[PDB]
Amino acid sequence: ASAIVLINTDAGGEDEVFERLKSMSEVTEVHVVYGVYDIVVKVEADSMDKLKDFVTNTIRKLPKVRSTLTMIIVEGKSLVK
Amino acid sequence: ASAIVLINTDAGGEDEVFERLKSMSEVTEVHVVYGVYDIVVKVEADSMDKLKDFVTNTIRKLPKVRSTLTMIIVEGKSLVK
Amino acid sequence: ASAIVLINTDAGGEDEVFERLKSMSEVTEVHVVYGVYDIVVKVEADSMDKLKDFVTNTIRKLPKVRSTLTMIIVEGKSLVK
Amino acid sequence: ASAIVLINTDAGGEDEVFERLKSMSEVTEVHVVYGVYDIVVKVEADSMDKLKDFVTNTIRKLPKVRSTLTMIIVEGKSLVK
Amino acid sequence: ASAIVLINTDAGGEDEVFERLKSMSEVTEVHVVYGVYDIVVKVEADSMDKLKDFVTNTIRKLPKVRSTLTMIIVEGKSLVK
Amino acid sequence: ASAIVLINTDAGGEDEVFERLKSMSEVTEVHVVYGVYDIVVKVEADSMDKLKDFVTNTIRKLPKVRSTLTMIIVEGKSLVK
Amino acid sequence: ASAIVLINTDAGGEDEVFERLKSMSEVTEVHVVYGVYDIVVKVEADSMDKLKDFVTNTIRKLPKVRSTLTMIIVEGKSLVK
Amino acid sequence: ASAIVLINTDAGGEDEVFERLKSMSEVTEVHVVYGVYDIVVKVEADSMDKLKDFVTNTIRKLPKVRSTLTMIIVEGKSLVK
Ligand SMILES: CC[C@H](C)[C@H](N)C(=O)O
Ligand SMILES: CC[C@H](C)[C@H](N)C(=O)O
Ligand SMILES: CC[C@H](C)[C@H](N)C(=O)O
Ligand SMILES: CC[C@H](C)[C@H](N)C(=O)O
Ligand SMILES: CC[C@H](C)[C@H](N)C(=O)O
Ligand SMILES: CC[C@H](C)[C@H](N)C(=O)O
Ligand SMILES: CC[C@H](C)[C@H](N)C(=O)O
Ligand SMILES: CC[C@H](C)[C@H](N)C(=O)O
Numbered sequence: 224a225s226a227i228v229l230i231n232t233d234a235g236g237e238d239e240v241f242e243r244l245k246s247m248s249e250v251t252e253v254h255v256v257y258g259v260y261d262i263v264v265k266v267e268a269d270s271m272d273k274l275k276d277f278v279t280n281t282i283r284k285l286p287k288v289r290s291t292l293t294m295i296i297v298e299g300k301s302l303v304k
Numbered sequence: 305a306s307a308i309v310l311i312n313t314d315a316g317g318e319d320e321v322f323e324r325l326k327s328m329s330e331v332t333e334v335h336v337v338y339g340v341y342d343i344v345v346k347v348e349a350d351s352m353d354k355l356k357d358f359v360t361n362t363i364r365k366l367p368k369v370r371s372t373l374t375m376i377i378v379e380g381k382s383l384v385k
Numbered sequence: 386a387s388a389i390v391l392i393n394t395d396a397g398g399e400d401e402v403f404e405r406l407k408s409m410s411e412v413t414e415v416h417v418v419y420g421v422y423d424i425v426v427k428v429e430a431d432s433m434d435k436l437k438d439f440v441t442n443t444i445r446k447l448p449k450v451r452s453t454l455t456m457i458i459v460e461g462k463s464l465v466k
Numbered sequence: 467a468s469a470i471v472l473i474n475t476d477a478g479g480e481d482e483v484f485e486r487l488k489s490m491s492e493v494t495e496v497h498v499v500y501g502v503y504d505i506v507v508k509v510e511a512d513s514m515d516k517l518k519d520f521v522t523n524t525i526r527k528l529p530k531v532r533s534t535l536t537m538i539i540v541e542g543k544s545l546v547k
Numbered sequence: 548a549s550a551i552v553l554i555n556t557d558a559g560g561e562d563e564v565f566e567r568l569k570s571m572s573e574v575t576e577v578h579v580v581y582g583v584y585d586i587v588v589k590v591e592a593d594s595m596d597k598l599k600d601f602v603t604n605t606i607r608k609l610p611k612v613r614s615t616l617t618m619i620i621v622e623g624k625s626l627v628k
Numbered sequence: 629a630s631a632i633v634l635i636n637t638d639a640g641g642e643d644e645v646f647e648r649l650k651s652m653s654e655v656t657e658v659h660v661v662y663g664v665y666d667i668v669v670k671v672e673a674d675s676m677d678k679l680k681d682f683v684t685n686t687i688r689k690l691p692k693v694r695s696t697l698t699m700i701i702v703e704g705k706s707l708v709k
Numbered sequence: 710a711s712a713i714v715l716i717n718t719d720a721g722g723e724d725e726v727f728e729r730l731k732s733m734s735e736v737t738e739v740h741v742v743y744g745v746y747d748i749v750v751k752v753e754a755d756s757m758d759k760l761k762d763f764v765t766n767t768i769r770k771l772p773k774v775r776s777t778l779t780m781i782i783v784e785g786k787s788l789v790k
Numbered sequence: 791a792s793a794i795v796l797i798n799t800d801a802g803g804e805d806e807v808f809e810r811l812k813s814m815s816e817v818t819e820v821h822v823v824y825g826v827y828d829i830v831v832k833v834e835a836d837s838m839d840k841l842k843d844f845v846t847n848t849i850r851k852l853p854k855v856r857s858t859l860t861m862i863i864v865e866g867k868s869l870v871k
Contacts, residue, residue: 226419227337227344234858235851241381255381255842256308257793257860258744263308263375275540278419283397290396293419294344295538297518300319300336302326307743315533316526338469338521338536339420356741356864365721372720374743376862378842388662389499389506403543417543418470425470425537437621440662445640452639454501455662457619459599462481462498464488477614478607500550500602500617501663551661551668558776559769565705579705580632581712581764581779582825587632587699616663624643624660626650631824680783683824688802695801698824700781702761713823713830727867741867742794749794749861780830786805786822788812 224274230262236287310373311343317368386436392424398449472535473505479530548598554586560611634697635667641692710760711782716748722773796859797829803854
């Protein structure tokens with residue numbers, strides 16, 4: 224299961240969150256960004272349940288995460304060169 | 305220069321736009337997604353001027369692209385495993 | 386009176402809120418969802434006043450409810466097969 | 467495969483879109499609504515590919531459909547009474 | 548039945564739409580405004596069905612209306628001094 | 629000086645905020661509403677400074693007021709019947 | 710009268726719009742930008758009527774302007790070093 | 791490096807935040823505004839790294855700053871008369 228998750232942090236907590244994210248195997252990329260969202264992660268998990276558990280029970284429970292917006296990727300419309 | 309671009313298309317045009325983007329050398333990854341955005345692209349250009357020229361004169365002049373939201377990725381806070 | 390309520394939760398609270406909602410008689414359906422909203426609920430109440438009281442005094446007083454967006458359904462433009 | 471799709475129509479086209487939506491078998495419920503969205507549909511498709519195809523090539527190609535926001539429902543966190 | 552409708556217009560059409568709205572009996576007040584919305588209107592109709600018909604068939608069929616967001620007012624939580 | 633202010637409260641505090649708002653002389657009308665906003669107020673102040681001060685130091689300091697969106701009404705494009 | 714106006718253009722029309730904006734005396738600054746808006750202008754006009762006329766009758770009528778969001782600046786809370 | 795930052799504060803904190811920002815040498819202009827954002831700041835830093843460090847460790851660690859939206863200004867599409 225694949226998704227891109229847009230994260231907003233508490234004001235000023237973006238670097239600390241990025242640091243946490245780096246260590247997790249399900250996070251295949253992570254970037255802090257300018258604009259309306261603060262961090263963009265690509266998440267690859269073994270199943271849709273494991274994606275859900277990861278989003279709800281890890282990412283959304285990390286210190287200083289405020290909100291997440293998970294964009295489920297369409298199977299067959301996804302390319303990483 | 306690196307950025308993630310959140311694209312909205314005209315309703316129904318997402319597959320057409322996807323296929324256009326995939327063949328562009330500045331586009332390193334592209335995904336159709338469920339939610340408030342339709343396509344997520346990661347763009348890598350040689351310079352910020354070349355990123356601007358790519359976003360404005362290629363991506364945003366594609367048929368059926370309605371809007372774009374470019375998130376400039378912060379140098380030194382960007383990991384692809 | 387009937388409505389669909391889009392709920393946002395505090396980060397990580399969406400399963401808990403989902404569980405509280407599921408057991409309430411006015412809730413005819415409830416779903417955790419990916420994207421900009423966390424929980425969608427269909428509410429059926431005997432009147433508009435009881436809809437009001439349910440939204441404000443039950444839904445919006447649940448722990449870890451951050452926001453709600455109640456969409457009143459139009460009488461005569463509503464089908465459940 | 468199940469989703470709740472939030473639709474905006476071109477101004478004034480909501481009743482016509484509603485009537486088109488109601489006769490589709492993948493649409494198990496459809497409601498015109500007050501607020502920032504115009505119609506709410508629950509879609510039940512046999513698979514995630516059939517969901518994508520119904521969203522992109524049916525819903526998003528209907529006349530007067532301006533935008534959609536598909537919310538993928540979380541398996542195991544979904545109840546219709 | 549009563550509501551406040553937030554209207555967005557096509558760029559440059561807000562004075563024209565304002566003028567069409569002003570003369571209609573269901574409109575009890577109307578204002579062009581700065582910000583994310585263009586026009587605020589208070590609507591008072593004899594019933595919820597007539598509210599519906601007014602929003603969809605008058606407001607949303609006005610030339611240069613792009614979008615509307617109708618906020619139904621809660622009975623018993625409404626004061627005009 | 630006239631404005632329409634859209635208020636969001638902390639979840640569940642809308643009735644308490646409404647009662648506080650209704651006794652203020654600068655508030656000429658106040659309504660709790662369904663949708664993305666929770667309360668709508670029209671504010672009439674003697675001047676733009678008095679508007680600012682009432683928005684910042686009264687409304688935005690009320691307990692359970694989370695955010696406001698003040699829409700400055702355009703002089704000459706405003707009618708209350 | 711002072712304001713900052715956030716402009717969204719038709720996809721790809723941002724440079725052409727920026728070029729138009731440069732020539733107008735009421736526009737004291739203009740910038741194209743990455744993210745959810747496309748151009749940021751500072752507008753200084755002689756009065757609130759002249760601000761309104763400029764926004765509605767010039768900026769919002771320019772080719773390829775799609776939307777504008779005008780943020781009225783608070784007198785006494787405005788500094789340009 | 792140049793950017794315009796759209797700031798939201800805790801309700802009522804806008805004047806406090808304004809006064810904090812005004813004295814910072816990276817802040818070249820600052821305005822409190824009516825609407826969906828509360829403060830607009832223009833930031834000029836010597837480098838993109840210094841912009842990031844300024845946004846994350848100064849602006850977004852100010853008391854009562856709730857969120858920020860940094861719009862990176864496009865080099866060569868930026869005029870201050
Ligand atoms: C460093 C950027 C931060 C996190 C935020 N997204 C902003 O645009 O202000
Ligand atoms: C499980 C998904 C959570 C609730 C949130 N809606 C997201 O998209 O990240
Ligand atoms: C009938 C309601 C329409 C479709 C729209 N959602 C509004 O709130 O104005
Ligand atoms: C196939 C998904 C489409 C593109 C849209 N983003 C939606 O959620 O409805
Ligand atoms: C006159 C204002 C126009 C209508 C728009 N609401 C803006 O803020 O730019
Ligand atoms: C009673 C309605 C509340 C305040 C909120 N606006 C909602 O739509 O859920
Ligand atoms: C004084 C204005 C405040 C900061 C807010 N932006 C509002 O519009 O309500
Ligand atoms: C050049 C940037 C354009 C205009 C747009 N704001 C974007 O972020 O895609």
